[PDB]
Amino acid sequence: NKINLNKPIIENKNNVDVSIKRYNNFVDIARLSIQKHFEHLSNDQKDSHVNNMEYMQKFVQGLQENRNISLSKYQENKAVMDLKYHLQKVYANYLSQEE
Ligand SMILES: CCCCCCCCCCCCCCCCCCCC(=O)O[C@H](COC(=O)CCCCCCCCCCCCCC)COP(=O)(O)OCCN
């Protein structure tokens, strides 16, 4: 139940959405999961990852396989955007910690 950042990114070819309830709950889980990964990163790493798109994609893709849920392409891109917003806030809190 861990994620491998060494797997390359694959095109999501599913165009059948999961329900909003499943999508939101998934995003909740993806949020905390990448938060824990990001918080364990070193200082210089969290600087290069906060806005790293490929990093969030690899996370959304891994999490889909592991949780055996298949988002649609559109849902996967929306989930990545969401993880971005979340990471920015995690990072904000970390920076003010450091202060
Ligand atoms: C496609 C685009 C989609 C984008 C969607 C946007 C949707 C908005 C996002 C949902 C809104 C929730 C946002 C909460 C703020 C997040 C920023 C804090 C994240 C964070 O790192 O806090 C960790 C704990 O989490 C926490 O529990 C702290 C959270 C702070 C909550 C802020 C208080 C607000 C009051 C709540 C009212 C409810 C509002 C009703 C909607 C602390 O880090 P750590 O504990 O892991 O460890 C390190 C400590 N040493």
Summary?
The chain is mainly alpha-helical. It contains 4 helices and no strands. The radius of gyration is 14 Å and the shape is globular.
What would your notes on this structure say?
The chain is mostly helical. It has a single domain, classed as Plasmodium falciparum UIS3 membrane protein (Methane Monooxygenase Hydroxylase, Chain G, domain 1), CATH 1.20.58.1330. Helix content is 69%, strand content 0%. It is built from four helices and no strands. The protein has helices at residues 20-40, 43-49, 53-66, 73-98. Helix 1 (20-40) runs parallel beside helix 4 (73-98) and helix 3 (53-66) crosses helix 4 (73-98). The protein starts with 19 loop residues before the first helix and ends with a helix. It binds phosphatidylethanolamine. Phosphatidylethanolamine binds at residues 35, 39, 78, 81-82, 85, 89-90, 93. It is classed as unknown function. The entry lists the keywords unknown function. It forms a monomeric assembly. The entry is titled "Crystal structure of a sporozoite protein essential for liver stage development of malaria parasite". The protein: putative uncharacterized protein PF13_0012. The organism is Plasmodium falciparum.
Q: Topology, please?
A:
Elements: H1 20-40, H2 43-49, H3 53-66, H4 73-98
The structure holds phosphatidylethanolamine.
Residues 35, 39, 78, 81-82, 85, 89-90, 93 line the site of phosphatidylethanolamine (PTY).
